[PDB]
Design a protein around this ligand. Sequence first.
Ligand SMILES: *[C@@H]1O[C@H](CO)[C@@H](O[C@@H]2O[C@H](CO)[C@@H](O)[C@H](O)[C@H]2NC(C)=O)[C@H](O)[C@H]1NC(C)=O
Ligand SMILES: *[C@@H]1O[C@H](CO)[C@@H](O[C@@H]2O[C@H](CO)[C@@H](O)[C@H](O)[C@H]2NC(C)=O)[C@H](O)[C@H]1NC(C)=O
Ligand SMILES: N[C@@H](CCP(=O)(O)C[C@@H](CCC(=O)O)C(=O)O)C(=O)O
Ligand SMILES: N[C@@H](CCP(=O)(O)C[C@@H](CCC(=O)O)C(=O)O)C(=O)O
Ligand SMILES: *[C@@H]1O[C@H](CO)[C@@H](O)[C@H](O)[C@H]1NC(C)=O
Ligand SMILES: *[C@@H]1O[C@H](CO)[C@@H](O)[C@H](O)[C@H]1NC(C)=O
Ligand SMILES: *[C@@H]1O[C@H](CO)[C@@H](O)[C@H](O)[C@H]1NC(C)=O
Ligand SMILES: *[C@@H]1O[C@H](CO)[C@@H](O)[C@H](O)[C@H]1NC(C)=O
Ligand SMILES: *[C@@H]1O[C@H](CO)[C@@H](O)[C@H](O)[C@H]1NC(C)=O
Ligand SMILES: *[C@@H]1O[C@H](CO)[C@@H](O)[C@H](O)[C@H]1NC(C)=O
Ligand SMILES: [Ca+2]
Ligand SMILES: [Ca+2]
Ligand SMILES: [Cl-]
Ligand SMILES: [Cl-]
Ligand SMILES: [Zn+2]
Ligand SMILES: [Zn+2]
Ligand SMILES: [Zn+2]
Ligand SMILES: [Zn+2]
Lengths: 690, 690
Amino acid sequence: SIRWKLVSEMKAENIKSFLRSFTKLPHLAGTEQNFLLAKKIQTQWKKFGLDSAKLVHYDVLLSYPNETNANYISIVDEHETEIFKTSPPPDGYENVTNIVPPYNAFSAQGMPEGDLVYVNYARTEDFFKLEREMGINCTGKIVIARYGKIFRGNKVKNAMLAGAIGIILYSDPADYFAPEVQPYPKGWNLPGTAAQRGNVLNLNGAGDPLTPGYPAKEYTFRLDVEEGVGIPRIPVHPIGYNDAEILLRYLGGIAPPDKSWKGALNVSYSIGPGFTGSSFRKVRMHVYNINKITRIYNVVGTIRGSVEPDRYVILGGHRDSWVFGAIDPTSGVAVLQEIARSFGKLMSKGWRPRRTIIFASWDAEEFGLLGSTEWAEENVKILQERSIAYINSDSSIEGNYTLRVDCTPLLYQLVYKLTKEIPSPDDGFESKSLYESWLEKDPSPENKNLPRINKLGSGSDFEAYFQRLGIASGRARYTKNKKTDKYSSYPVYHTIYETFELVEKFYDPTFKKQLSVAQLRGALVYELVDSKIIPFNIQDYAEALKNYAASIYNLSKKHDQQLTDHGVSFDSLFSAVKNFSEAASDFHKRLIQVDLNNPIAVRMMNDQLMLLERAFIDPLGLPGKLFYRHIIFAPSSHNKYAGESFPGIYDAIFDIENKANSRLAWKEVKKHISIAAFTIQAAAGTLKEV
Amino acid sequence: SIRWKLVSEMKAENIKSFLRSFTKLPHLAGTEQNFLLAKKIQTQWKKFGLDSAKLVHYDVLLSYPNETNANYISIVDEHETEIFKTSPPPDGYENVTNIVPPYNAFSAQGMPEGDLVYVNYARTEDFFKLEREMGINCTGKIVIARYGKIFRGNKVKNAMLAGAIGIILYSDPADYFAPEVQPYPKGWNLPGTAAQRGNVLNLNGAGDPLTPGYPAKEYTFRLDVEEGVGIPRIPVHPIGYNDAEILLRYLGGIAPPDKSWKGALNVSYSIGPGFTGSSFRKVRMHVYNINKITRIYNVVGTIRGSVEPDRYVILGGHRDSWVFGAIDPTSGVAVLQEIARSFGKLMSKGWRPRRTIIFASWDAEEFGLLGSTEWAEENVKILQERSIAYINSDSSIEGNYTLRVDCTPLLYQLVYKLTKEIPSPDDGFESKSLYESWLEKDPSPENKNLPRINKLGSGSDFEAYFQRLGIASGRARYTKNKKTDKYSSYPVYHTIYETFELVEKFYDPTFKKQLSVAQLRGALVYELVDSKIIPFNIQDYAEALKNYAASIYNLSKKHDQQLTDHGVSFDSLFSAVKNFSEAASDFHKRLIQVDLNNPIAVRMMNDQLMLLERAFIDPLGLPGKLFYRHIIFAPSSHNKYAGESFPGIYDAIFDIENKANSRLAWKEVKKHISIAAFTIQAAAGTLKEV
Ligand SMILES: *[C@@H]1O[C@H](CO)[C@@H](O[C@@H]2O[C@H](CO)[C@@H](O)[C@H](O)[C@H]2NC(C)=O)[C@H](O)[C@H]1NC(C)=O
Ligand SMILES: *[C@@H]1O[C@H](CO)[C@@H](O[C@@H]2O[C@H](CO)[C@@H](O)[C@H](O)[C@H]2NC(C)=O)[C@H](O)[C@H]1NC(C)=O
Ligand SMILES: N[C@@H](CCP(=O)(O)C[C@@H](CCC(=O)O)C(=O)O)C(=O)O
Ligand SMILES: N[C@@H](CCP(=O)(O)C[C@@H](CCC(=O)O)C(=O)O)C(=O)O
Ligand SMILES: *[C@@H]1O[C@H](CO)[C@@H](O)[C@H](O)[C@H]1NC(C)=O
Ligand SMILES: *[C@@H]1O[C@H](CO)[C@@H](O)[C@H](O)[C@H]1NC(C)=O
Ligand SMILES: *[C@@H]1O[C@H](CO)[C@@H](O)[C@H](O)[C@H]1NC(C)=O
Ligand SMILES: *[C@@H]1O[C@H](CO)[C@@H](O)[C@H](O)[C@H]1NC(C)=O
Ligand SMILES: *[C@@H]1O[C@H](CO)[C@@H](O)[C@H](O)[C@H]1NC(C)=O
Ligand SMILES: *[C@@H]1O[C@H](CO)[C@@H](O)[C@H](O)[C@H]1NC(C)=O
Ligand SMILES: [Ca+2]
Ligand SMILES: [Ca+2]
Ligand SMILES: [Cl-]
Ligand SMILES: [Cl-]
Ligand SMILES: [Zn+2]
Ligand SMILES: [Zn+2]
Ligand SMILES: [Zn+2]
Ligand SMILES: [Zn+2]
């Protein structure tokens, strides 16, 4: 088959060669090297035989350290004397000059000074525990939080809400140092001198902070920088664990409340505020990063469909990194090139797809999904009426245990089908499929005989396509074993030590695991773009809605008396879900009857398949979040990396027992139950024959 | 042709018989008689042979007088003694019991007392003149305004902003008494005892006040009534001119400022506050209408398409009236029945349309477009992806001089084409077409060789379809001669005197003018639903955008120094308009080349024609107005009946010289210029081939 030709043409050695070629120098967004990498990708797509390959630019707010006013944290004594201050490229890269020092992009500027408080992971539950159980008031304090568990911008939002005047982020070995592995370069663990870069915005889907809603073109209106969406109002800076140990060692005050607050350093993990047993009197931060409008460049290419050129499947991945980014994103950049090359080989033998493929290399993803979101804002009118699906191509290889897939229920069946026809790259599975190894290693909690597929929140460039525009989206990559590996992300994430050599020595020396991910991403694009009937299954969406309705109802049971007292009922939601299940079953019964030789009959049913995900989009958005529009899924308000189901109801019920005004609070729950019931009923209505 | 069979089957005598049958009794929304009229329309559509005809209900907030606490206005002396108080069915209707007394639906309740001020038509410019030129402060006053010029809800919003505590509305003979015509029943003029009913909400497109965004179903969340959208916060009541003359006669204070403030009554038109020359000391209002959730019923029917059943042309008109409503809306109800009957006659000979026709009889239009807007909110997901156009069928006969058409530029060419093939009903034009008489009587200001077509604002049930959803819309009716007839609406508008006998004796005894309107509305539906290529012209939209851009730029010239000082430029708007004109020309050049025997080629271009109007819809809405989403048109903020072009820019520049903060004000102008330029460029992008 053509799909087998596409998959079998892809080669591990080619992914390895692309990865080495793209990882020799840092390629930070807005810098000359990441522009040169765009032009290189463009040249390659033209050689492969794509119909077009263009650079598409935007001018967006970025953030960088000031070379002549360096950031630091210090400890001062009562006489204002600095007692301590926080502070080469990896082997082989000694001549690389322009590695950006560690910083958190979009931190406020300032020099706050105060007592230090340790706040664990700075999650919502950690600040609840501090205030409600531990007697700690963070107002006016500098807080120190360990990285991990949730997106760092959520930590900063939480510290702002708790009244902190600054937040120090650090990498604790409990979370970034795998047991019995040596630090880089001898092993793949994080050294104590390395800090994790990353932005600390709270954009909620907005894209460029200065141009929410509209693409950042040269004529475009810009908000004043002080009103930029999502920009934090306190300083934020990241440090490695050698420096963190010095800051934590003499913290006094209360003992850590339980073992879940204690990391792995040889310190007490006492909470503060203040020091004991030391010259250590106050902590200071000094953070002076600069925000500036900077040009970014997406590469956008196409293969135009031969039958339905006005229908799109998008394969997009980011190219910008914090330093070399050999895993994030460049492993995905290398995969995207190998998929485009393979589609080019098909074209060289006369094939053309039924629908149009759009290939995209996004810029400034690490600064808030900026390039992919600005392009979605520019092209929203054609994208929302014509797109079948978005397949991401970020990091392919964050661990070497098994596959991880996150996607809409519409795509579950296609994912399972395609993984059965891709050889497993895993040791011990040499005559078995990827589906077989994935099922053995990560069975789904809700059905032991299927592999786990996760919900979509945010974290990568599919966000605007799925959460704002309602385009079916999916992602797949290799990952760690969650039952034995307790570290967050991977140890060297967003450090200088994400090098080609790390990937080849420690993650995937044969490049077979990366190859399996390229084969799956490419095969998904192929089936979505070439199949006469779009390969979605809406009965799988109906089953998912039944599970999500049971989950949100279960989370309401502990408030049963309040539900009765305030007249709150989930009956309309369960009725809408029942009606959707009936409509989805009836739709599939009619779909198998379609006359495949009648092009308008086929197109009308394909439009229903394409527009189903769109029915879940509410133009009014979610509360406070104009740009999260999907009623079934949104990024969690507590952790943008995680997807939450029925987000409007979930947020309305969360911590409701502590709301000041219970009558108002329960009316908000009733509002969002009503919106969810309407939206699912409306979606069911789009499937009806008459 | 089939179109000629549709048009020629329609008969004046049938429109007359329908109108007589629907106008014997009042048919106020939410009352038993208007439900009985729905079931009658349903029975008729089934007899005609429609595929379906269903009642679709919603429970929405309506407003009615309290039978046991009647409304009134009084004049009291300084001893609190009532000196004056404001206060049968038409001939032939003496036994009709349930005529609703005059009131303004959704008025606040209250009994304010104070000095009286005359505020002319209570337009924005009248309140500017009062405050800025005449030295009058309306704070704490009862104001009296004449009806006319603008929607009455705008008068009430303006009086609230000026600080009034109540507003009396009245019909001045200057505006509702045509010269040398006798009052009803001897002629068609307004008697001095009659008052005009009508709602006084400021909904801005929201629909039911309690359920903005979502259809008002039985499970639906409802706002608390005190938070209902658009509900005024002062009492409002309407009176006839015999009563108004008594209230105006002894007003003292300043003389009317110029003749444009003087109506036709034998009173001075002095402004107040206060009385002179009289026992007349203070005015009181007493208004106690009740707001209550009430069931309403739309009738929705279909003829399913034979080729593209998933594409819709909607023909909708309201059925509810204030009293008998023989003009508004029942002349349009009679027309809609005659069009449905004629389509049924086509079906009886074996015809079926290419696309689907949706017929709708809307309820509660007179209470804020409620039935049509709730149905749009219920069906938004299918409507926005599948609708070709909306054709209204409200009043057909508001005067007897010539045609009036209001529609999107997409429909100009079709309107002109069809009017050339409909016989003119006008005396003296017996061998000429309707186009010929319309052109002679109402030439367009921008092209003397075409009839005038107006922009769409609000005022009838097309509003949500066009302004919220971006579905091409049009309306047509017979109207008065504006160059000789200076009265607003028609004299008996919204009174008990809108009777069948009024229409037959004074407006259109032969029913030929009503017939010509039925023929045009039906022919528009037919061509939109049956033509292989949707009959829109996008180069006419390009020309319209050039005119609107020149108009908004011209309105900015008096601020030229401020444009320079604040760095405001219209360059991006003119560049987007140029790019749209090029894209529209290129689209039409490709459209004539389409292979008409290739169904997917045809469908792809029809999708571009259908989705063009949608490209102008911004889900973020206009400032303060979530439900007006069209960037090119919106109802005027000063008069919802009028359409305004580039509404976001217009409102940003309006009265800008009086804004407190000029830097902020000009930044808002720049924002809305940027949004308009983006939106037109995005719309141009939807026409591109690649
Ligand atoms: C699911 O579909 C059913 C059947 O159409 C809807 O049930 C109606 O519910 C209303 C109250 O909302 C009752 O007045 C009707 O009598 C019901 N008809 C039946 C049971 O045949 C139900 O409303 C739909 N669910 C939603 C959320 O729209
Ligand atoms: C209309 O189309 C033109 C041509 O594509 C656009 O012109 C570009 O304008 C930008 C500044 O916005 C310049 O950087 C380019 O050099 C222009 N290219 C030309 C003139 O070939 C113009 O931006 C479009 N208008 C809008 C509103 O998008
Ligand atoms: N592991 C995460 C993050 C991958 P990422 O590319 O590194 C994204 C980047 C920006 C996110 C944002 O601004 O919203 C960040 O998390 O710092 C995932 O896969 O989902
Ligand atoms: N002459 C006007 C009004 C016709 P209408 O049907 O009477 C509408 C009705 C309700 C309007 C509203 O609530 O927005 C009103 O104006 O009071 C027109 O044609 O456009
Ligand atoms: C960088 O810091 C130096 C020293 O404070 C300052 O003079 C300079 O203005 C800064 N650069 C920017 C772009 O703010
Ligand atoms: C938090 O501490 C600050 C100290 O300035 C104080 O204003 C506030 O009342 C305290 N709140 C709680 C819950 O202790
Ligand atoms: C890669 O897999 C090998 C073999 O199972 C294992 O020893 C190594 O730890 C894995 N690497 C990482 C980075 O997990
Ligand atoms: C009508 O007015 C009477 C007299 O004030 C009052 O008792 C009654 O409650 C009113 N009806 C409603 C529905 O408010
Ligand atoms: C309007 O009159 C009221 C009288 O109470 C007063 O509060 C306000 O200052 C006056 N404003 C103007 C512009 O005269
Ligand atoms: C109807 O037309 C006749 C003949 O021109 C005219 O005398 C009469 O005033 C018109 N009626 C109205 C209501 O305008
Ligand atoms: Ca933007
Ligand atoms: Ca509603
Ligand atoms: Cl990915
Ligand atoms: Cl109309
Ligand atoms: Zn990253
Ligand atoms: Zn990434
Ligand atoms: Zn009316
Ligand atoms: Zn009407």
